Amino acid sequence: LMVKVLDAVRGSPAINVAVHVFRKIYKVEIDTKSYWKALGSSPFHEHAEVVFTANDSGPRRYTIAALLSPYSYSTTAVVTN
Amino acid sequence: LMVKVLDAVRGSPAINVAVHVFRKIYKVEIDTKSYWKALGSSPFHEHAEVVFTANDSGPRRYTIAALLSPYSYSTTAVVTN
Amino acid sequence: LMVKVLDAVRGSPAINVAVHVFRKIYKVEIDTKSYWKALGSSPFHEHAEVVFTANDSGPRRYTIAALLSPYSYSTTAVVTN
Amino acid sequence: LMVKVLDAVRGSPAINVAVHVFRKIYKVEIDTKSYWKALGSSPFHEHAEVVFTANDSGPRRYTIAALLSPYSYSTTAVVTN
C-alpha cells in the first residue's frame, strides 16, 4: 500500500485536504433550532396538561455567495444598496 | 495497491480533496428546525391533554450564488437595489 | 490495482474531488422542517386529546444561481431592483 | 504502508490538512438554540401543568461570503450601503 497525495507542488495553491487511510469531515450549522430533543423514561405519565407555543418572529434574510465553491481567478461581491 | 492523487501540480489551483482508502464528507445546515425530535419510553400514557402551536412569522428571503459550483475565471455579484 | 487521478496538472483548475477506494459525499440542507420526527414506545396509549396546529406565515422567496454548476469563463449576477 | 502528503512544496500555499492513519474534523456552530435537550428519569410523573412559551423576536440577517471555498487569486467584498 502506498498513498501519494499532492507531491512536488510548485506554486500558490488553495488546498483543503483530509486523508483517511485504514489497513488490516466538515460540519457547518447556522441558526439551528431544536425543541424537546429527547426526554427521559416515562414522562407525563398520568394527567398531564401542556400548552406549547413557539414564536420565531420578524423577517429573515440569508445571503450566501459561493457556498462550497472554490475560486481560481475571480471577483465576488455582495453589494447591498 | 497504489493511489496517486494530484501529482506535480504547477500553479494556482483551487482544490477541495477528501481521500478515503480501505484495505484488507461535507455537511451544511442552514435554518433547520425540528420539533419533538425524539421522546422517551411510554410518554403521555394516560389522560393527556396537549395544545401544540408553532409560529414561524415574517417574510423570508434566501439568495445563494453558485451553491456547489467551482469558479475558474468569473465574476459573481449579488447586487440588491 | 492502480488508481491515478489528476496527474501533472499545469495551471489554474477549480477542482472538487472525493475519492473512495476499497479492496479485499456532499449534503446541503436549507430551511428544513420536521414535526414529530420520532417518538418512543407506546405514546398516548389511552384517552389522549391532541390539538396540533402549525403556522408558516409570510411570503417566501428563493433565488439560486447555478446550483451544482461549475464555471469556466462566465459572469453571474443576481440583480434585484 | 507509506503515506506521503505534500512533499517538496516550493512556494506560498494555503493549506488545511488533517491526516488520520490507522493500522493493525472541523465543526462550526453559529446561533444554535436547544430547548429541553434531555431530562432525567420519570419527570412530571403525575398531575403536571406546564405553560411553555419561547420568543425569538426581531428581524434577523445573515451574510456569508464563500463558506467552505478556498481562494487562489481573487477579491472578496461584502459592501453594505
Added chain:
Amino acid sequence: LMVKVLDAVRGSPAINVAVHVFRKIYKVEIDTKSYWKALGSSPFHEHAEVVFTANDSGPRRYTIAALLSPYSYSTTAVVTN
C-alpha cells in the same frame, strides 16, 4: 509504517495541520444557547406548576467573510457604510 508530511518546504506557507497516527479537531461555537440541558432523577414528580418564558429580543446581524476558506493572493474587506 512511515508517515511523511510537509517535507523540505521552501517558502512562506500558511499551514494548519493536525496529524493523528495509530498503530497496534477544531470546534468554534458563537452565540449558543441551551435551556434546561439536563436535570436529575425524578424531577417535578407530583403536582408541579411551571411557567416557562424566554425572550431573545432585538434585531440580530451576522457577517462572516470566508468561513473555512484559505487565502493565497487576495483582498478581503467587510465595509459597512
